[PDB]
Amino acid sequence: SGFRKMAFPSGKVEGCMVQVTCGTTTLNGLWLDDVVYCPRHVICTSEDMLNPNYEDLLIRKSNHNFLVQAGNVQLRVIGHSMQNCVLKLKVDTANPKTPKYKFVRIQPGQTFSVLACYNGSPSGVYQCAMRPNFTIKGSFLNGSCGSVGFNIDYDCVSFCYMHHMELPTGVHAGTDLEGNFYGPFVDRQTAQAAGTDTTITVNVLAWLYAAVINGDRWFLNRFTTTLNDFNLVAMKYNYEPLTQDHVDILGPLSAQTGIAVLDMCASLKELLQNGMNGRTILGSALLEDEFTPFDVVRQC
Amino acid sequence: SGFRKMAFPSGKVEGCMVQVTCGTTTLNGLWLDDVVYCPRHVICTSEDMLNPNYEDLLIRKSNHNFLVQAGNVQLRVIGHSMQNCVLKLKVDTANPKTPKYKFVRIQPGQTFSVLACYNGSPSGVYQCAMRPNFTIKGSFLNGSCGSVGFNIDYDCVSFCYMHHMELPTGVHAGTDLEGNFYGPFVDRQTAQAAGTDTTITVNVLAWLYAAVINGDRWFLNRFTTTLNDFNLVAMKYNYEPLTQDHVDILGPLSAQTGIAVLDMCASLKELLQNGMNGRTILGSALLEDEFTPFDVVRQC
Ligand SMILES: Cc1cc(-n2c(CC(C)C)nc3cc(O)c(O)c(O)c3c2=O)ccc1F
Numbered sequence: 001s002g003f004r005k006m007a008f009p010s011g012k013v014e015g016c017m018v019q020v021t022c023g024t025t026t027l028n029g030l031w032l033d034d035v036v037y038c039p040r041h042v043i044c045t046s047e048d049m050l051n052p053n054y055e056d057l058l059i060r061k062s063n064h065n066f067l068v069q070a071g072n073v074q075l076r077v078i079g080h081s082m083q084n085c086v087l088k089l090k091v092d093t094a095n096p097k098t099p100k101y102k103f104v105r106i107q108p109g110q111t112f113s114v115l116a117c118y119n120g121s122p123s124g125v126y127q128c129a130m131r132p133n134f135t136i137k138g139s140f141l142n143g144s145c146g147s148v149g150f151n152i153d154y155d156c157v158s159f160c161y162m163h164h165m166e167l168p169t170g171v172h173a174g175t176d177l178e179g180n181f182y183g184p185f186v187d188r189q190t191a192q193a194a195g196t197d198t199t200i201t202v203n204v205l206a207w208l209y210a211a212v213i214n215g216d217r218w219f220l221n222r223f224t225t226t227l228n229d230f231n232l233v234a235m236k237y238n239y240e241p242l243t244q245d246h247v248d249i250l251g252p253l254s255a256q257t258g259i260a261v262l263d264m265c266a267s268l269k270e271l272l273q274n275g276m277n278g279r280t281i282l283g284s285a286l287l288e289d290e291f292t293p294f295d296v297v298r299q300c
Numbered sequence: 301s302g303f304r305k306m307a308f309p310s311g312k313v314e315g316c317m318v319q320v321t322c323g324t325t326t327l328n329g330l331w332l333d334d335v336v337y338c339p340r341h342v343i344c345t346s347e348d349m350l351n352p353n354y355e356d357l358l359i360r361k362s363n364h365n366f367l368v369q370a371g372n373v374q375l376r377v378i379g380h381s382m383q384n385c386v387l388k389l390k391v392d393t394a395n396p397k398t399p400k401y402k403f404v405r406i407q408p409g410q411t412f413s414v415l416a417c418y419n420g421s422p423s424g425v426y427q428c429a430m431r432p433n434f435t436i437k438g439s440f441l442n443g444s445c446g447s448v449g450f451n452i453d454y455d456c457v458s459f460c461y462m463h464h465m466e467l468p469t470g471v472h473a474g475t476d477l478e479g480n481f482y483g484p485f486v487d488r489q490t491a492q493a494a495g496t497d498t499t500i501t502v503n504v505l506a507w508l509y510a511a512v513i514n515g516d517r518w519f520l521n522r523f524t525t526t527l528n529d530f531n532l533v534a535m536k537y538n539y540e541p542l543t544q545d546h547v548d549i550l551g552p553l554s555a556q557t558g559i560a561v562l563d564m565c566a567s568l569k570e571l572l573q574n575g576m577n578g579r580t581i582l583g584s585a586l587l588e589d590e591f592t593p594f595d596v597v598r599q600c
């Protein structure tokens with residue numbers, strides 16, 4: 001029993017975190033086989049950021065401009081190149097702690113764990129969702145660039161996020177591990193801001209199921225709604241539309257609790273229209289939307 | 301910016317988790333140097349639990365009754381003994397991944413990370429507080445016994461919790477690593493239940509400071525209160541009394557935000573008397589009490 005925001009064990013990723021220094025900037029890098037991945041703005045000075053031509057700055061660099069430290073051991077950089085917004089520093093040593101890994105890009109609404117790092121040293125691990133507006137509500141101080149997000153499946157680490165910058169509202173923007181930003185953000189100084197966000201409906205539903213599995217039942221009722229009538233209510237309250245595919249995905253959880261998806265939607269409609277009247281669900285007074293259906297099955 | 305429930309990187313603890321089987325029971329063990337630590341009820345059958353004499357059950361055991369598996373490698377048990385409520389299985393191999401470690405007992409109100417494990421395999425990591433009633437609000441399914449709680453300080457893992465059982469309200473009870481239970485709980489079948497709980501005041505205050513550091517300010521005000529007048533309000537709302545030592549501990553956070561502790565107490569008094577009026581603090585509609593002052597400084 002119990003339900004917590006649970007990250008994946010981070011050990012497999014901790015063994016890949018290194019420190020990359022170029023000029024006066026030190027940030028974090030991901031060391032897999034004989035390649036070190038890090039944000040390309042490591043090659044920039046502060047005054048470069050207005051309109052950096054990264055093609056410029058990189059040709060003006062050479063291997064010895066990059067100091068790579070794995071723990072106490074210096075790694076010798078033997079090659080450098082750019083892929084989109086990440087830098088690939090080829091080193092002379094394959095990381096013996098390289099786990100089986102994948103570079104996958106996630107969808108808004110999916111979750112992952114973040115290993116927050118400073119100077120190549122892991123500091124903490126926590127769960128995140130990719131928001132519908134492609135930001136993440138992380139916890140990052142200056143120095144955390146290069147920290148990565150990931151899922152683990154059996155033995156295989158699927159890296160999905162690298163941290164690049166904080167936006168003006170305090171949320172976070174980054175790339176997949178091929179260097180392509182999530183969302184309409186760039187690694188140069190602009191007034192870029194997070195777009196408007198929505199609540200991830202299928203996740204809220206999944207979390208309600210986690211609540212029923214854990215003995216919270218006060219919000220259940222005898223009503224059902226149609227998918228169309230629920231979606232009218234969702235749009236009013238700034239929730240993603242619910243699709244039949246979401247309904248299908250919630251199936252297992254529906255079967256385990258004996259509460260039909262559209263039966264649970266009726267409860268969600270009541271919660272949105274009436275609030276909670278001073279009660280809580282799984283220790284929260286808000287509707288939580290950063291647990292996927294998979295996260296719930298995983299933990300329950 | 302941002303503020304999340306952040307666990308410590310679990311890699312150092314993952315390398316110590318093993319699987320301990322005795323009879324038909326398989327649970328988790330902590331492998332440090334040439335000793336494997338696990339709950340002593342691993343030697344019990346279900347029908348033993350009414351009034352087990354653990355001195356009994358253990359003398360009726362021998363080394364080969366205990367199967368210890370570290371990943372795929374079987375560990376040979378060469379000694380067994382009981383210390384309070386934990387079993388110490390001496391094995392013929394010192395764990396080469398033994399970190400620097402300590403066995404420390406924590407106080408109610410302190411926090412730690414839990415590496416939830418099944419069959420010796422780490423499943424997830426998350427943050428917990430030891431409640432004032434010595435339970436923890438964890439996330440544990442059957443099979444999770446032997447999972448440990450810990451803090452990390454520099455390079456040193458201070459183990460503070462081993463999981464033993466779930467209580468009827470769904471909260472969790474366990475021991476320190478010397479086998480002494482937190483709170484008035486026993487590893488035998490009774491109607492034992494969590495005692496009444498209170499809210500950890502100094503932590504709520506710390507979290508309010510984390511909120512001010514992150515730009516949440518709507519709950520601040522120009523009032524101050526006396527320590528005694530705040531404590532009258534705390535007792536009414538089932539909050540721990542606030543001591544001068546708590547006030548001292550909050551000092552750094554007070555200095556960093558320029559908000560005097562008793563100034564923040566006045567805000568806490570208003571929040572308790574009026575609620576939040578539909579607003580949120582750090583994404584929560586409840587007053588959070590599972591961040592210590594240290595947790596806040598650590599993350600901010
Ligand atoms: C103005 C601006 C700054 C950055 N920037 C840079 C780039 C540097 C040359 C100032 N380096 C970082 C390093 C970190 O370790 C970190 O955590 C960060 O957030 C940043 C970061 O944001 C990115 C785009 C921009 F338009």
Ligand SMILES: Cc1cc(-n2c(CC(C)C)nc3cc(O)c(O)c(O)c3c2=O)ccc1F
Nearest residue numbers: 341344345346442443444445465466488489
């Ligand atoms: C009735 C009762 C059960 C237990 N008990 C036992 C003991 C076993 C012989 C049934 N083994 C566990 C193994 C886990 O892996 C786990 O997660 C658990 O919660 C337990 C657990 O609770 C402890 C005291 C009790 F009075």
